[PDB]
Design a protein around this ligand. Structure first.
Ligand SMILES: [Ca+2]
Ligand SMILES: [Ca+2]
Ligand SMILES: [Ca+2]
Ligand SMILES: [Ca+2]
Ligand SMILES: [Ca+2]
Ligand SMILES: [Ca+2]
Lengths: 203, 203
């Protein structure tokens, strides 16, 4: 279905308040009429600025705090306070910007793998989460790199760590401490965007 | 009735092209669908910019040239070119700015009034035309001032000229030339802003 009862405003707008959100339109043509709103942050963050039905935002918004607001519109005869229309529900949607980097879910991950496993043996999985909107182009798309120990292990872009060599010998080294870094597809990183993986070689 | 199938963009936008108009929303689905538009200046002035159904304008607009544009939106599966919704009609409205001053096309008006008429006697009506939108915030509200001949006549903000004295005497002076200035209520005046009124006393 087509969804038309929506307004959209970008988060984190850094030009001077207030900021234009969108415009209400009722077909009545009583010019004693006024647009009135109620609902989530109606008349605090979002205010009508008239007489045309324009709604403005009076705070900078963070989609990661609240991503949308449910409001209801009216239109009122200011002579007699009569409601001229049925009220109309709508949503003000806060449009995502890429303002978060992926952050690992743990400071230290642990795994193990038998010594002398074939090249490309899966060891363990690391995970970083990006607080941006995962339905927007790439904003919460996470990619991974090993930045210390990449000669010994590789990582795929799901965070899966694999042996990078077929000759890992427990006698030479029984525990690797490797450093992983995460970074969203638009390049945003990072700290808490690194972590450590302790990988023990088993006998 | 509430009219939700609308977008609005201000005319005579001075910042870098291109300029955000609004956003289409289908509750569909893919994951493989694309927003496609047709209609007045679709795909030349107005283009979808992807992938969330945002429309942008690629020219500056003049409401006085064209005030609105009828378009139809589609949502199409990229794979097989199947439509995924019935099309939806919508209008892109161009929001007025105050960029026109009242213009006198007729620059000489003629009126008459009996000599020795009382103060406040109606003489004639002058009219200047303002090309902006009469439904928006004073933009085409015309006001008038007398800038020559104030001692003898007044003008109201509807352009009606009145006697300013009860002793206008046909034997002493049978004809006056006053000059009227028009400007809109927001102060905009320009090159065609004055007219002469030739007033003759009768009896
Ligand atoms: Ca944010
Ligand atoms: Ca991100
Ligand atoms: Ca964000
Ligand atoms: Ca214009
Ligand atoms: Ca205009
Ligand atoms: Ca004007």
């Amino acid at each position: 279905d087509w969804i038309w009862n929506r307004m959209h405003i970008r988060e984190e707008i850094d030009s001077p308040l207030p900021h234009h959100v969108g415009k209400l339109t009722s077909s009545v043509g009583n010019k004693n009429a006024m647009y009135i709103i109620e609902g989530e942050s109606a008349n605090t963050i979002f205010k009508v600025q008239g007489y045309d039905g324009d709604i403005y935002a009076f705070e900078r918004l963070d989609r990661e705090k609240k991503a949308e607001y449910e409001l209801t519109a009216h239109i009122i005869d200011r002579r007699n306070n009569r409601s001229l229309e049925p009220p109309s529900k709508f949503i003000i949607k806060v449009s995502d910007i890429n303002d978060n980097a992926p952050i690992f879910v743990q400071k230290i991950f642990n795994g193990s793998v038998p010594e002398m496993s074939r090249l490309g043996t899966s060891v363990t999985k690391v995970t970083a989460e990006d607080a941006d909107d995962p339905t927007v182009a790439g904003h919460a798309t996470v990619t991974y790199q090993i930045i210390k120990g990449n000669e010994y292990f590789t990582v795929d872009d799901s965070g899966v760590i694999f042996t990078a060599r077929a000759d890992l010998d427990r006698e030479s080294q029984s525990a690797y401490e490797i450093i992983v870094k995460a970074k969203d597809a638009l390049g945003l990183t990072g700290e808490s965007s690194t972590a450590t993986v302790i990988i023990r070689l088993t006998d």
